[PDB]
Chains A and B, each alone.
Chain A
Amino acid sequence: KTAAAAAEHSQRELDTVTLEDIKEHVKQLEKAVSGKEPRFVLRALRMLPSTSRRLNHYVLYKAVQGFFTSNNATRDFLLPFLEEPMDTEADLQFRPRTGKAASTPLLPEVEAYLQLLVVIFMMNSKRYKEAQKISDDLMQKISTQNRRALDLVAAKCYYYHARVYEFLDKLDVVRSFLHARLRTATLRHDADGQATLLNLLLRNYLHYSLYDQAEKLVSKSVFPEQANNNEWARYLYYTGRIKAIQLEYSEARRTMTNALRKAPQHTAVGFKQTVHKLLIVVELLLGEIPDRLQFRQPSLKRSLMPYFLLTQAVRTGNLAKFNQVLDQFGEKFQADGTYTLIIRLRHNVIKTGVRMISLSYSRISLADIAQKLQLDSPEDAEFIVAKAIRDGVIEASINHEKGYVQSKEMIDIYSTREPQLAFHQRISFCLDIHNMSVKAMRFPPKSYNKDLESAEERREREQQDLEFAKEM
């Protein structure tokens, strides 16, 4: 039993600390309601993911018996969900609420938090059918109430509820739930909760191919300005992919890059790869070459390899390399649900090559164009070369009769007005950040004006004495 004894020390140490931790959190929720301002609620909620994996069956068992001291229905059904710890010789009376507090019914906020915990622990427990049932009880209750502080906690409960169905692989069943919730979220409430809902309702559309009706919701529904800087990261990504599939590339790149910089740095490493993967594909379609810095990061080296090799063929005008790169890694493109965007790169592989070929040569034989671009024939080279001229890919015209593509000497770009346009873009935003910087400057000043230099009584007393002697 030596091995069991060693495990007992670790288990006992962990549960005691967290149990005290839950008590600290609950007081914050009571504090937030006590002060009538919902800001405190986030203080316990933020740590919720960190403490998510720091709870055991023993931890939860006391909580249900501890916080819900009143003989509520919870003990009727909550106990069977969670395995009861065996009779322990070292038993202590753990009552978070004493006297009137224990008898007094738990507030909705504390009620939401605790129930939020049991589902969370169950999720780590892999039990789903049970989680959904409990989730339904927790979710059904918070809809009936209309407390202002409950919205913040409800937001989290809103999210994890969908996750429960995710492992349940239902999705469709929960869609109407969010749509209705966003229905009440906009009007009955006004913010801080529909941000989480919008991402969730948006997510279900992406999980399937339901892009057609997904774009409808974005165009109509708006998003709160106060999105906690965490929900905003998801909103940009999903909205980035929606525009990505519909040829709205220009805003696709800007939306994602904004999501990238607003995305958490230290954690959320899993979704950094997915956001990066789509951005490099969206950039490639646009034509701009993605930066090489993020193909060398420790957490992106392996993931981006199937996409780094792609950028090797796209950057080089040759088309055969792209085809030879597709057959090698086509499967992983299937696996990541992005192959749809790659099969449309064949046009870009020609546009880039024709751009460089027309940039480096001045009068190249029409047949020679096909060989360098692996066009497979000279007859069709004219059209794409001809077509490339219309869109503005290259400038100079072609000699149909002779059979050579000529290029115009495009020099002295500085005189043109384009450099001023490029400077306006940088100038406008650079002058923007300074305005924002002053925005946070007027917050810090708070009760910092009453600061006497040396003193008040000492100066006054000395002056009066000197004046009397000055006269005589």
Chain B
Amino acid sequence: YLMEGSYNKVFLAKGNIPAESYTFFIDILLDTIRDEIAGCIEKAYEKILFTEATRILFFNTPKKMTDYAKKRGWVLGPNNYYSFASQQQKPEDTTIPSTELAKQVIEYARQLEMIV
């Protein structure tokens, strides 16, 4: 379930444990789930109101997200949350590729002329 995105089952299993409460570990998973869920939603999506993210996992209307938003981004606006991802300024460059490419071709020349 963790390997794929299926998480609604994880909380369903969180309430069904074979040995005992096992809460000494489920608390550990909380760190490995919420951090992942926030990261996924961090992509270049549009505004998401504080109504889906609030009542989604287990809680109705807590203050955790307020802290959650504070340590993450999600700039606060007119009930407007943004998640912008460009990854476009960095790409589209060959000067750095130029040095890598120059080494590459020289190796072709190196291993084409000199005797090994």
Please report the C-alpha to C-alpha distance between residue A390 and residue B44 in the assembled complex, in whole angstroms.
Answer: 11
CB contact under 8 A between A380 and B108, given known A397-B44, A399-B46, A400-B45: no
CB contact under 8 A between A397 and B111, given known A380-B6, A383-B6, A435-B116: no
Q: Total number of A-B contacts with CB less than 8 angstroms?
A: 58
**0 or 1 for each of B44-62: is its CB under 8 Å from A? (1 = yes):** 1111110010000000000
Beta-carbon contact of B4 and A386 below 8 Å = no
Sample 27 A-B pairs with CB under 8 A, ordered by A number: A347-B3, A347-B4, A350-B4, A380-B8, A382-B5, A383-B6, A383-B37, A383-B40, A384-B5, A385-B5, A386-B5, A388-B5, A390-B39, A398-B45, A399-B45, A399-B46, A400-B45, A400-B48, A401-B46, A401-B47, A401-B48, A401-B49, A424-B104, A427-B108, A431-B108, A431-B111, A435-B111
Q: Is A220 an interface residue (CB 8 A)?
A: no
With both beta carbons as reference points, the residue of chain A lying nearest to B3 in the complex is identified as A347
Please report the C-alpha to C-alpha distance between residue A350 and residue B1 in the assembled complex, in whole angstroms.
Answer: 12
Q: Is B68 an interface residue (CB 8 A)?
A: no
Give min CB distance, B14 to chain A, whole Å.
15
Beta-carbon contact of A379 and B4 below 8 Å = no
Which of chain B's residues have a CB closer than 8 A to the CB of A435?
A: 111, 116
Q: Is B69 an interface residue (CB 8 A)?
A: no
- Additional A-B contacts beyond A384-B6, A388-B5, A390-B40 (12; CB < 8 A): A344-B3, A350-B4, A380-B7, A380-B8, A383-B8, A384-B4, A387-B40, A397-B43, A400-B45, A400-B52, A401-B49, A424-B104
Consensus secondary structure, chain A interface: helix
Beta-carbon contact of A387 and B43 below 8 Å = no
Please report the C-alpha to C-alpha distance between residue A214 and residue B48 in the assembled complex, in whole angstroms.
Answer: 49
Q: Is A389 an interface residue (CB 8 A)?
A: yes
CB contact under 8 A between A379 and B5, given known A387-B40, A397-B44: no
Q: Is B77 an interface residue (CB 8 A)?
A: no
Interface residue ranges of B99-116 to A (CB < 8 Å): 101, 104, 108, 111-112, 116
Give min CB distance, B115 to chain A, whole Å.
8
Beta-carbon contact of B3 and A386 below 8 Å = no
Q: Is B97 an interface residue (CB 8 A)?
A: yes
Please report the C-alpha to C-alpha distance between residue A118 and residue B21 in the assembled complex, in whole angstroms.
Answer: 62
Interface range on chain A: under 10, 10 to 19, 20 to 34, or 35 or more? Answer: 20 to 34
Which of chain A's residues have a CB closer than 8 A to the CB of B108?
A: 427, 431
Q: Is A417 an interface residue (CB 8 A)?
A: yes
Which of chain B's residues have a CB closer than 8 A to the CB of A377?
A: 8
Give min CB distance, A163 to chain B, whole Å.
39
With both beta carbons as reference points, the residue of chain A lying nearest to B100 in the complex is identified as A417
Q: Is B9 an interface residue (CB 8 A)?
A: yes
Please report the C-alpha to C-alpha distance between residue A202 and residue B47 in the assembled complex, in whole angstroms.
Answer: 56
Please report the C-alpha to C-alpha distance between residue A238 and residue B93 in the assembled complex, in whole angstroms.
Answer: 43
Q: Is A346 an interface residue (CB 8 A)?
A: yes
Interface residue ranges of A345-383 to B (CB < 8 Å): 346-347, 350, 377, 379-380, 382-383
With both beta carbons as reference points, the residue of chain A lying nearest to B112 in the complex is identified as A431
Beta-carbon contact of B7 and A383 below 8 Å = yes
With both beta carbons as reference points, the residue of chain A lying nearest to B115 in the complex is identified as A438
Please report the C-alpha to C-alpha distance between residue A346 and residue B2 in the assembled complex, in whole angstroms.
Answer: 12
Q: Is B26 an interface residue (CB 8 A)?
A: no
Q: Is B29 an interface residue (CB 8 A)?
A: no
Which of chain A's residues have a CB closer than 8 A to the CB of B97?
A: 417
Give min CB distance, B51 to chain A, whole Å.
10
CB contact under 8 A between A386 and B116, given known A380-B6, A400-B48: no
Please report the C-alpha to C-alpha distance between residue A384 and residue B46 in the assembled complex, in whole angstroms.
Answer: 19
Which of chain A's residues have a CB closer than 8 A to the CB of B40?
A: 383, 386-387, 389-390
Which of chain A's residues have a CB closer than 8 A to the CB of B39?
A: 390
Which of chain B's residues have a CB closer than 8 A to the CB of A346?
A: 4
**6 tightest Cβ-Cβ pairs between the two chains A and B:** A387-B5, A384-B5, A383-B5, A380-B8, A347-B4, A386-B40
Please report the C-alpha to C-alpha distance between residue A384 and residue B36 in the assembled complex, in whole angstroms.
Answer: 12
Please report the C-alpha to C-alpha distance between residue A382 and residue B7 in the assembled complex, in whole angstroms.
Answer: 10
Please report the C-alpha to C-alpha distance between residue A348 and residue B112 in the assembled complex, in whole angstroms.
Answer: 42
Please report the C-alpha to C-alpha distance between residue A434 and residue B60 in the assembled complex, in whole angstroms.
Answer: 68
Q: Is B41 an interface residue (CB 8 A)?
A: yes
With both beta carbons as reference points, the residue of chain B lying nearest to A400 in the complex is identified as B48
Which of chain A's residues have a CB closer than 8 A to the CB of B8?
A: 377, 379-380, 383
Which of chain B's residues have a CB closer than 8 A to the CB of A350?
A: 4
Give min CB distance, B93 to chain A, whole Å.
10
With both beta carbons as reference points, the residue of chain A lying nearest to B9 in the complex is identified as A380
**0 or 1 for each of A420-443: is its CB under 8 Å from B? (1 = yes):** 100010010001000100000000
Which of chain A's residues have a CB closer than 8 A to the CB of B5?
A: 380, 382-388
With both beta carbons as reference points, the residue of chain A lying nearest to B111 in the complex is identified as A431
Please report the C-alpha to C-alpha distance between residue A435 and residue B97 in the assembled complex, in whole angstroms.
Answer: 28
